[PDB]
Amino acid sequence: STNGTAHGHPHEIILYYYELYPTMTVVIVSVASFVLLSMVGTAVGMCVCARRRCITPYELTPGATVPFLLSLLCCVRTTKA
Amino acid sequence: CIFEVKHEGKVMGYACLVGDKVMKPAHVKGTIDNADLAKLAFKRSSKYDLECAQIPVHMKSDASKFTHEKPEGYYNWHHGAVQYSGGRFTIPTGAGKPGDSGRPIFDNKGRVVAIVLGGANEGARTALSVVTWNKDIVTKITPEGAEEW
Amino acid sequence: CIFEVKHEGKVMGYACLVGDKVMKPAHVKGTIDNADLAKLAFKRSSKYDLECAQIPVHMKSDASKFTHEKPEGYYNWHHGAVQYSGGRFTIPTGAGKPGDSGRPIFDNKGRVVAIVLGGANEGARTALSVVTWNKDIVTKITPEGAEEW
Amino acid sequence: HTTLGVQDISTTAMSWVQKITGGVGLIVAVAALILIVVLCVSFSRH
């Protein structure tokens, strides 16, 4: 019965759920959530690294700005004033 | 230019208005005993044991210069005369004690030349561990075996 | 070389004949109190808060040359002596009020060195916000918290 | 007959989308390490 079409794109992807199932999709969703967490963790780490770069230049005087802008954004926005 | 850091109503160290920043050693506990200065946002720097911020426009006239220019000879500081030579500031051992960090070493024209952080005792004289300006950028000279004041 | 901008019969700022142009701060309300100058066509420039035009041939002999050359020391202005140092012009607070914009800061040889736009009060002294010449090009220095006069 | 645990196909297509995610994570991890390396260079320079 229930037709488990291929795609596409995705669409027909969720159709398979009906075919062999209870489960399947939930586990995939959990995996997606884990991937999102990894993506979020990376971003958080990147922002902390961006601070690590901006450090030194935090004390302090003529010398960027410049950096700035090249600056990721934050650089710049301290640079102010 | 010199302002005192107080902690539980007790002077711990000092803060100084050098260049266009407001300095005070990072290790000093307390808060600058000056409204305008106390409410500022300082940027700590554990390498230099420094903790600077920017001087409010209404006090910028109160800063003390600075300068990279420091020829061998004698410099001035609160306890007397510092001696510079061989790329090292020194003083008669005993004339500098814990609680002297933050105190500037002026020259004869008033330009701040370095800021004391501590000193290493090497007998008759103690080699100071200071924060000094290079060509343009800040630097920190710490003699072997310094005792952070 | 100096001419006054009047508004509803009241002096608001000034206009100056520098180089081969006729200057007056853009923010100043009124019209130059001089027939020849008033009927001119000015080109506004909001970045520089400047508003220049060209000096009529019959007044070109009346212009004032300017200069980028400004060594630390004292300069001259209508209310007294301005002080230059640390890349900042200052004066005793109170000696400059709203309605002083446009007034030039001459040196001892008469060369206009900067043109006052306003000032920031930083206590005893006020850091002026001026229009000054660089290597060749115009520039504007505005101390933190300036009050546009 | 057949009924078994994947994964399987729908393969290809599935890989197309999967390949898009995680690469950027590797990039920012490498960049983080490189920033640390440069920081250590500065520390050595001082």
Curated annotation (Swiss-Prot), chains B, C:
Domain of life: Viruses
Protein known as: Capsid protein
Cystine connections: 1-16
Motif (Nuclear export signal): 32-42
Compartments in which it is found: Virion; Host cytoplasm; Host cell membrane; Host nucleus
Record-marked site positions (Involved in dimerization of the capsid protein): 75, 108
Function of the protein: Forms an icosahedral capsid with a T=4 symmetry composed of 240 copies of the capsid protein surrounded by a lipid membrane through which penetrate 80 spikes composed of trimers of E1-E2 heterodimers. The capsid protein binds to the viral RNA genome at a site adjacent to a ribosome binding site for viral genome translation following genome release. Possesses a protease activity that results in its autocatalytic cleavage from the nascent structural protein.
Active site positions, chain numbering: 27, 49, 101
Start and end residues of each stretch annotated as Interaction with spike glycoprotein E2: 43-48
Free-text note regarding domains: The N-terminus contains a nuclear localization signal and a CRM1-mediated nuclear export signal. The C-terminus functions as a protease during translation to cleave itself from the translating structural polyprotein.
Subunit structure as annotated in this protein's UniProt entry: Homodimer. Homomultimer. Interacts with host karyopherin KPNA4; this interaction allows the nuclear import of the viral capsid protein. Interacts with spike glycoprotein E2. Interacts with host IRAK1; the interaction leads to inhibition of IRAK1-dependent signaling.
Chain segments carrying region Dimerization of the capsid protein: 71-81, 107-111
Domain Peptidase S3: 1-149
